[PDB]
Nucleic acid binder design. Structure first.
Ligand code: MG
Ligand code: ZN
Ligand code: ZN
Ligand code: ZN
Lengths: 84, 263, 65, 56, 33, 46, 56, 132
RNA sequence: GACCAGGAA
């Protein structure tokens, strides 16, 4: 039933899988002519556009992390650390 | 006399043993490569077959026909069919050969390269005649027949080079050696006991001074002097394989300058 | 199955030499290592070409149409 | 076990392998023949629209 | 007297034609010696 | 002038057309062959 | 057989001639592959999402 | 030639090393349906069926056969056959394959059926994935 | 297409 942001306990870093899904999802959406929130500086490959959206933390997505019990923490890709 | 030099050691219809001197090895090698791979020759390249009653399959025969050496002396005044202007081929770019054979005898009847005959017009240039070095003058035994065995086909020979198919190779093996006493140490001799005893001296050891062990190793040294031997299949006379190769290579090195210039 | 024209390895013309090698054998009663050499076959790639050839066509021939 | 946990699948290919000293570690040499059979569904987009039209 | 089916013959068995056949017989018979 | 088929064993030409029953002439056998197209085929000698 | 993670790995395509899949010699061992005639399967993703999964 | 593969001399291959003939022989017949309802070796066209192979019927003579000498390839139709109904059955060359019709053979089944075998030769030249 | 049988990195 979702955990309040001030009580979140998971890694504040982004996981290989989170990132691969984030990049993949945006690139899909970009491929489908969705709005791009970055200057494609001559870019044209939706992945690289997405890798670039991610590099500038302008991806308006949220990872909803599920706990084994069913509850969850929502994390903004804004706020996730990407030393990954 | 000038730059690189030659001395000829033996010579025949089809073998030139000689010595290159005062040259880059790379150069000596390039000539070797060119001689093998890039000197133009005529060989049968298309075979239309009207009748075949042989134990040998159409293409099996076709393939052999490509390997019969043809007179390629004046080959440079035949055009590459690719550049000639006719649709397909003409007299300007190709020689037409014809082969008809029928087992007349009871005993097995033999189809030799001698049984080819040039139908096209030669414009009187040395070309297309099958090479025959044969003692009884039959040339390559193409195929064998029994009785109702009939072979009727037609050949179109074109200009080409070994890079495209080996059938166009004017030269067979090319013997190439240097520094027969390993004085450059360009090789390290495998041995059980004595590198000297196990490894046979080359004929060319006679043509350079033995190293004499009371001597420091000459690192300054460099490979010039190369004992070569060219052997011609016959489509072109040996000497010409050497020359034309020299020429062919040169033409290449030239085309480079020429492109350098349209640049 | 019939003599190769030209040795695979080096490319020396070989298909003319067949009947000679057969004759250097039967009539001259030379042995192979000489019969081959008499035909100026020296680089062993060319030696093997003739020495180890099995001329099956001569069998194929014996069937009829 | 054989229809659900596993399946025969579309967009797949197989052939003899051989190794290359001249490929980079993470690439694979694909025969032109297979390249021509195997497809990728690309969406028409302003980014690709000309290149895409070119291939078509 | 009476017919009772057919027995497949092993080639080159006593009962097969090729048993007694000669080399040139075979070649003529379209059969590899 | 022109054949359709060839006897297998005796190899006489046999120029028959459909609905004729398949069998050689003088030769008993029933094997019969096709005889190549007059449309001369060509090969590169490579 | 595919007993490893490493038994299926993502590669960059390089379309080339001849009819073999060519691969870098050093990736030979995690596949268990030798060129004594062994064939190999190649699957091709269809979604933008799935190629991501592969490359990432 | 690393790891149980080998380098082979192209020049040698040309000169004829390791080349092979390869033959495949396709086969067919007309199957009677008791009361003389039979099939047919023939080259068919359109005509009320429309259910027939999607490659060239044109290599066929009028006996639904190819004369041996012709290049085939793809699903060229090597044999033509037909079935009635109360108006296809043709045998295309193996999709993956190609070659030259080598021998064609027209004869009878132990019954009395039109029985046919078509052989096709190809030469196979040593190429890269080939094993030795 | 079932089913049986035989042979491969
Ligand atoms: Mg293996
Ligand atoms: Zn011309
Ligand atoms: Zn040789
Ligand atoms: Zn007959």
């Amino acid at each position: 039933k979702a955990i309040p942001k001030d009580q979140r306990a998971t890694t504040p870093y982004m996981t290989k899988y989170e990132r691969a899904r984030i990049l993949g999802t945006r690139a899909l959406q970009i491929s489908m002519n969705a709005p791009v929130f970055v200057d494609l500086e001559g870019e044209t490959d939706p992945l690289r556009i997405a890798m670039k959206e991610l590099a500038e933390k302008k991806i308006p997505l949220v990872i909803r992390r599920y706990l084994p019990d069913g509850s969850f923490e929502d994390w903004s890709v804004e706020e996730l650390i990407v030393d990954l | 006399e000038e730059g690189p030099q030659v001395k000829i050691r033996e010579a025949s219809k089809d073998n030139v043993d000689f010595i290159l001197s005062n040259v880059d090895l790379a150069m000596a090698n390039s000539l070797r490569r060119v001689m093998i791979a890039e000197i133009p020759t005529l060989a049968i390249d298309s075979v239309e077959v009207e009748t075949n009653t042989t134990v040998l399959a159409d293409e099996f025969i076709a393939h052999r026909l490509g390997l019969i050496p043809l007179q390629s002396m004046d080959i440079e005044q035949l055009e590459y069919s690719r550049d000639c202007f006719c649709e397909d081929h003409c007299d300007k770019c190709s020689v037409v050969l014809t082969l008809q054979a029928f087992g007349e005898s009871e005993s097995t009847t033999n189809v030799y390269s001698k049984d080819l005959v040039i139908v096209s017009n030669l414009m009187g240039r040395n070309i297309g005649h099958p090479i025959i070095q044969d003692k009884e003058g039959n040339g390559v035994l193409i195929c064998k027949l029994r009785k109702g065995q009939e072979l009727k086909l037609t050949c179109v020979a074109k200009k080409g080079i070994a890079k495209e198919h080996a059938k166009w190779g004017p030269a067979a093996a090319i013997e190439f050696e240097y520094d027969p006493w390993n004085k450059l140490k360009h090789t390290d001799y495998w041995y059980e006991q004595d590198s000297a005893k196990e490894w046979p001296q080359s004929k060319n050891c006679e043509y350079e001074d033995p190293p004499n062990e009371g001597d420091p190793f000459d690192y300054k040294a460099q490979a010039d002097t190369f004992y070569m031997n060219v052997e011609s299949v016959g489509s072109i006379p040996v000497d010409q394989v050497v020359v034309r190769g020299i020429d062919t290579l040169q033409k290449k090195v030239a085309s480079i300058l020429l492109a350098l210039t349209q640049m | 199955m019939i003599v190769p024209v030209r040795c695979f390895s080096c490319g020396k013309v070989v298909g003319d030499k067949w009947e000679s090698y057969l004759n250097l054998l039967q009539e001259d009663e030379l042995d192979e290592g000489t019969a081959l050499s008499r035909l100026g076959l020296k680089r062993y790639c060319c030696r093997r070409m003739i020495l180890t050839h099995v001329d099956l066509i001569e069998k194929f021939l014996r069937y009829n149409p | 076990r054989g229809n659900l946990m596993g399946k025969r699948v579309d967009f797949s290919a197989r052939t003899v392998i051989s190794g290359d000293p001249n490929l980079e570690l993470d690439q694979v040499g694909v025969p032109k023949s297979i390249a021509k059979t195997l497809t990728y569904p690309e969406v028409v987009t302003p980014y690709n629209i000309d290149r895409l039209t070119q291939l078509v | 007297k009476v017919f009772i089916g057919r027995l497949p013959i092993m080639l080159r068995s006593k009962n097969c034609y090729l048993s007694e056949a000669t080399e040139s017989d075979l070649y003529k018979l379209k059969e590899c010696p | 002038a022109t054949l359709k088929y060839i006897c297998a064993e005796c190899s006489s030409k046999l120029s028959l057309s459909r609905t004729d029953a398949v069998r050689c002439k003088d030769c008993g056998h029933r094997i019969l062959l096709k005889a190549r197209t007059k449309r001369l085929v060509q090969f590169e000698a490579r | 057989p595919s007993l490893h993670k490493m038994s299926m790995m993502a590669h960059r395509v390089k379309v080339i001639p001849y009819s073999t899949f060519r691969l870098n010699l050093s990736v030979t061992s995690p596949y268990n592959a030798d060129f004594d005639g062994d064939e190999m399967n190649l699957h091709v993703p269809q979604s933008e999402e799935t190629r991501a999964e592969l490359s990432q | 030639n690393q790891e149980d593969s080998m380098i082979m001399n192209q020049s040698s291959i040309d000169r004829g090393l390791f080349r092979s003939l390869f033959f495949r022989s396709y086969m067919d017949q007309e199957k009677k349906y008791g009361m003389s309802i039979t099939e047919t070796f023939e080259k068919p066209q359109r005509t009320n069926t429309l259910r027939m192979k999607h490659g060239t019927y044109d290599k066929l003579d009028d006996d639904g056969l190819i004369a041996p000498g012709v290049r085939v390839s793809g699903e060229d139709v090597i044999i033509g056959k037909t079935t009635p109904i109360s108006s296809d059955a043709s045998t295309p060359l193996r999709s993956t394959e190609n070659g030259i019709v080598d021998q064609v053979l027209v004869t009878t089944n132990q019954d009395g059926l039109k029985f046919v075998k078509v052989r096709v030769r190809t030469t196979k030249i040593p190429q890269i994935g080939d094993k030795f």
